Amino acid sequence: RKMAFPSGKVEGCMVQVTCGTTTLNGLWLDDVVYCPRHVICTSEDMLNPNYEDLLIRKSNHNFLVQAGNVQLRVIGHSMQNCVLKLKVDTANPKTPKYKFVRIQPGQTFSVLACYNGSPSGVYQCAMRPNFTIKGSFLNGSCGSVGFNIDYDCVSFCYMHHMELPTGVHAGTDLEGNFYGPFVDRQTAQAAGTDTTITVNVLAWLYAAVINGDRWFLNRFTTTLNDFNLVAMKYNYEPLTQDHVDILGPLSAQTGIAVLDMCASLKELLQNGMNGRTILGSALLEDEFTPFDVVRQC
Amino acid sequence: FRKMAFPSGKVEGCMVQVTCGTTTLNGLWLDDVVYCPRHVICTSEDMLNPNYEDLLIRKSNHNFLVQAGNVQLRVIGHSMQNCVLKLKVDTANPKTPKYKFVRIQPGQTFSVLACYNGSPSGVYQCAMRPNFTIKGSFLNGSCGSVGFNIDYDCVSFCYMHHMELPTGVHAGTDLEGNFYGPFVDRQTAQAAGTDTTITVNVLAWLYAAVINGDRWFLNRFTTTLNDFNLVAMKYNYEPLTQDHVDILGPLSAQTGIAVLDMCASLKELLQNGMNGRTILGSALLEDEFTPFDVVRQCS
Ligand SMILES: *[C@@H](O)[C@H](C[C@@H]1CCNC1=O)NC(=O)[C@H](CC(C)C)NC(=O)O[C@@H](Cc1ccccc1)C1CCC(F)(F)CC1
Ligand SMILES: *[C@H](O)[C@H](C[C@@H]1CCNC1=O)NC(=O)[C@H](CC(C)C)NC(=O)O[C@@H](Cc1ccccc1)C1CCC(F)(F)CC1
């Protein structure tokens, strides 16, 4: 099943941020609140905002930050790329051990979707090769964050800013830099051609086998390069030797050599699933990493 | 449409571990009571077929190790209610949310916080199947993990995890210790009924497709509830109840499509197939999104 990290450590950091008639979510760590900078915009501003110009015209008191019932007083503000940093007079006692990371395409993370500073739901996402994410975000979800948890440490990797015409989503790392060629302006933006995350499809095929589902296997094999030629033809990402190494544990667990599973995937790509299903899906799933599969099986 | 779990923090604040001897599982700490599966009192060998009453008679408060993290919670009373143990502890959980215990119906969905040794590992959304199993992800040590819904501020606990069936699916109790389905907490082979498709949820999914502009399958006809139920059963679909018709009300009102007209549309899909088409980007009809899940995600 698609499993997210427990969201409690992040819930304790969500607040509401309002400027004018614009409300969204912020992330309160220690005495700083992080949020998308387009909170400072009006309707007119959003088409071609000059953010540095808009921000110098703002005072601390134009920012209304609420942690539940309690307003937090803003005593400082700065902008780092597409993120606004609001210094507040009080520290969050619920601040977890945390870091800010920038994730790579193909990696997965959990999203805590929030509205008006209140958590609504949690789900698992992957950073697509074209640097979009297939999220579930509505009006008011900006400032929702994505994260992974290791031991007691929350690694924040994503802050939500926008939806594209196709319905997929785009956002930034916590330094305010977009993933992908996108801009925080109210304009229709296309992404580059997406590709399928091959190492993740293979991991999920291994998961299907670990759960006793093996109709798709075969006795053929393939070289790494010959598989990569077919993959690219079908708009699948190439598989590196590191990807092969990272699948080792799953190969050992099942006794199916990585390149043998590549041969299975090749046959699926060339012939399709013939109305069949794998782990209940009519489509090859590519948003489980090898680590996700291992951690859960 | 994503499988979206509830935020898990209010439940994370209630997870503890319970150990008897070397048997450890998870428990749920609310106020000054810890709830857990009663088979914590079994040796691995007693699980073959345990006599729980006799096993518990030999137990005292001081045989139970309850820990929140590595901090011990002293047990001051114990009792067994059906298949759950209730351990009274000397500290009221400061993180107790507003809560209730509810018994869910097959087809309803809930979030599971999968825990090991009292530590949450992940959260995911589950549906109770019509045969009273869930298709969970649960490893050794996961028993006592709970399933829940959140309404406003209030956590409704509906599931506590006890066992895995030969087919890989999972079975458990409500928080009063009453199993869902015909299962018992004994380490013996037990078969679920053949499963069926959750009709009310497929209908919810068809309403969601309409809301998003995908409506090629809407037909000109209607049906009675009884005629629909008799046909649906021939395709291994669950019959609808009056409660199902009522919980489809909001989506019916939002789209202007009567419930029985949507049933007629589904009947046609069942009798004629998708004729090569797709709905919401899928050749398969999805049955693990409830009417509430649709509303919760679309609006
Ligand atoms: C929690 O204590 C644990 C969770 C199980 C273990 C793995 N996945 C799960 O969901 N529950 C049990 O171990 C449970 C205890 C009984 C007293 C109810 N027994 C159980 O789940 O048995 C199944 C899995 C298992 C196999 C081998 C060792 C331990 C557990 C068996 C599978 C085959 C069967 F169905 F025929 C009999 C039970
Ligand atoms: C922040 O909460 C919000 C989240 C969006 C809202 C819907 N789903 C989301 O994920 N982001 C924005 O409002 C963002 C603001 C810019 C200044 C960066 N704009 C945005 O996402 O625009 C898309 C969605 C939208 C539609 C209608 C009204 C408001 C927002 C548009 C999609 C259609 C388009 F491509 F033509 C233009 C952008």
Side-chain angles (χ1 to χ4, degrees), chain A residues 3-43 45-57 59-63 65-68 70 72 74-86 88-93 95-96 98 100-133 135-149 153-218 221-273 275-284 286-290 292-294 296-297, chain B residues 2 4-45 47 49-57 59-73 75-94 96-97 99 101-134 136-150 153-219 222-233 235-274 276-291 293-299:
Chain A
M3 195 176 305
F5 287 106
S7 57
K9 296 184 164 53
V10 179
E11 292 169 52
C13 304
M14 295 315 298
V15 301
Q16 183 189 235
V17 177
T18 294
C19 192
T21 69
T22 308
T23 298
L24 41 66
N25 308 284
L27 185 77
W28 182 24
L29 307 168
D30 297 316
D31 58 1
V32 173
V33 177
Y34 303 77
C35 71
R37 64 181 181 176
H38 70 257
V39 66
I40 69 175
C41 293
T42 77
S43 52
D45 282 318
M46 279 163 155
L47 190 68
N48 180 23
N50 186 314
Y51 281 109
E52 288 286 16
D53 225 46
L54 297 175
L55 180 60
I56 194 111
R57 305 175 194 263
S59 322
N60 287 327
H61 72 260
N62 300 133
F63 297 105
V65 180
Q66 297 210 127
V70 175
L72 305 178
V74 180
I75 59 169
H77 65 268
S78 62
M79 175 167 72
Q80 179 176 11
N81 300 314
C82 300
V83 299
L84 173 66
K85 294 192 275 201
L86 303 177
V88 290
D89 58 5
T90 188
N92 189 0
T95 307
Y98 76 89
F100 289 172
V101 309
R102 192 183 171 82
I103 57 162
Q104 309 286 331
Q107 292 189 263
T108 55
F109 56 99
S110 298
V111 171
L112 179 69
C114 301
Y115 300 89
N116 300 115
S118 294
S120 178
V122 65
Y123 53 89
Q124 195 78 345
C125 278
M127 182 58 60
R128 308 293 312 158
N130 72 356
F131 290 110
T132 65
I133 74 169
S136 188
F137 294 111
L138 308 171
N139 274 350
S141 61
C142 286
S144 295
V145 299
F147 59 100
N148 283 270
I149 307 189
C153 184
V154 177
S155 293
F156 292 105
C157 61
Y158 179 85
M159 187 171 262
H160 185 52
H161 297 244
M162 67 196 307
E163 186 167 303
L164 307 189
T166 58
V168 300
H169 297 99
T172 68
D173 63 22
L174 270 291
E175 295 188 337
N177 285 313
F178 263 90
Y179 291 99
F182 304 109
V183 170
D184 49 341
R185 113 217 308 233
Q186 185 76 31
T187 63
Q189 300 172 51
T193 277
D194 207 12
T195 50
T196 300
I197 307 160
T198 307
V199 59
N200 288 3
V201 175
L202 292 167
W204 171 83
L205 292 177
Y206 279 112
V209 165
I210 297 179
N211 285 265
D213 202 359
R214 9 171 82 232
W215 68 261
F216 51 88
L217 299 186
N218 63 40
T221 192
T222 186
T223 69
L224 179 60
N225 184 66
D226 286 342
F227 170 78
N228 277 336
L229 288 167
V230 176
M232 290 181 295
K233 174 182 183 196
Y234 285 92
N235 263 317
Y236 272 53
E237 290 287 296
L239 201 68
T240 68
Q241 186 57 48
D242 295 343
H243 294 150
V244 172
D245 294 340
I246 292 144
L247 290 163
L250 285 177
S251 180
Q253 183 172 353
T254 57
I256 301 178
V258 178
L259 289 171
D260 286 355
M261 196 64 85
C262 288
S264 293
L265 180 50
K266 194 192 282 179
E267 160 171 61
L268 290 175
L269 293 180
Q270 287 168 346
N271 310 338
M273 286 174 62
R276 306 208 50 168
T277 67
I278 302 170
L279 286 171
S281 179
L283 304 169
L284 304 179
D286 75 341
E287 303 209 351
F288 296 87
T289 68
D292 295 339
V293 170
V294 166
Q296 170 166 342
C297 291
Chain B
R2 293 209 149 253
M4 189 182 299
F6 288 96
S8 58
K10 292 182 191 324
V11 180
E12 289 168 56
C14 301
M15 294 317 298
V16 297
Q17 48 182 327
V18 183
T19 298
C20 288
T22 61
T23 301
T24 299
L25 39 67
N26 306 285
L28 184 70
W29 181 17
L30 303 164
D31 294 318
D32 66 347
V33 176
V34 171
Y35 306 77
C36 68
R38 66 176 177 174
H39 72 255
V40 70
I41 72 182
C42 297
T43 69
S44 57
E45 191 65 21
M47 295 176 195
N49 179 19
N51 176 351
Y52 284 111
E53 282 80 31
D54 162 63
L55 283 164
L56 189 61
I57 239 151
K59 301 280 286 204
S60 305
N61 294 327
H62 63 77
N63 299 132
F64 296 97
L65 176 61
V66 177
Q67 300 169 107
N70 284 326
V71 180
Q72 175 177 8
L73 282 181
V75 172
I76 61 175
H78 61 279
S79 69
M80 175 169 69
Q81 176 183 8
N82 307 305
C83 299
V84 299
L85 196 65
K86 291 189 283 192
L87 308 174
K88 188 175 171 200
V89 293
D90 70 356
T91 305
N93 180 358
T96 302
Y99 72 97
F101 291 170
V102 311
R103 187 163 176 88
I104 57 162
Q105 276 292 97
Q108 288 192 247
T109 57
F110 53 94
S111 299
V112 173
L113 177 66
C115 294
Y116 299 92
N117 297 96
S119 297
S121 62
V123 63
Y124 58 90
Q125 193 82 341
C126 266
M128 179 67 65
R129 303 307 305 179
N131 67 0
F132 291 114
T133 67
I134 65 174
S137 168
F138 290 115
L139 307 184
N140 298 335
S142 62
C143 283
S145 296
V146 300
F148 60 100
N149 286 274
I150 310 183
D153 65 318
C154 183
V155 183
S156 286
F157 293 102
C158 57
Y159 180 82
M160 180 164 272
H161 182 51
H162 296 237
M163 64 188 313
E164 184 172 295
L165 294 192
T167 73
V169 302
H170 296 106
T173 66
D174 62 17
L175 269 291
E176 302 188 311
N178 292 309
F179 263 90
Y180 292 102
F183 308 106
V184 294
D185 49 350
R186 292 142 55 175
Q187 185 96 7
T188 182
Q190 298 167 63
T194 70
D195 200 22
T196 52
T197 300
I198 305 165
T199 307
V200 63
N201 290 357
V202 173
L203 292 169
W205 172 257
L206 295 178
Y207 276 109
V210 173
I211 289 162
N212 285 274
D214 202 356
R215 50 178 187 268
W216 59 266
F217 50 85
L218 296 178
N219 72 359
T222 193
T223 181
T224 65
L225 192 50
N226 182 69
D227 290 350
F228 174 79
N229 280 354
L230 291 180
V231 173
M233 289 195 324
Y235 293 86
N236 271 98
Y237 270 57
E238 279 298 298
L240 295 167
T241 66
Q242 183 59 41
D243 283 355
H244 293 153
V245 172
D246 294 332
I247 61 173
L248 288 164
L251 292 167
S252 180
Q254 179 177 355
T255 61
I257 301 179
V259 171
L260 286 172
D261 297 358
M262 193 66 88
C263 287
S265 286
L266 176 55
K267 177 191 296 210
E268 214 61 13
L269 290 180
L270 292 183
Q271 287 175 337
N272 311 114
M274 311 265 282
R277 323 191 54 163
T278 78
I279 296 172
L280 284 172
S282 170
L284 308 192
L285 300 178
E286 172 64 44
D287 83 339
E288 294 214 351
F289 291 98
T290 70
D293 295 327
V294 167
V295 157
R296 158 157 179 252
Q297 250 200 87
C298 285
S299 310

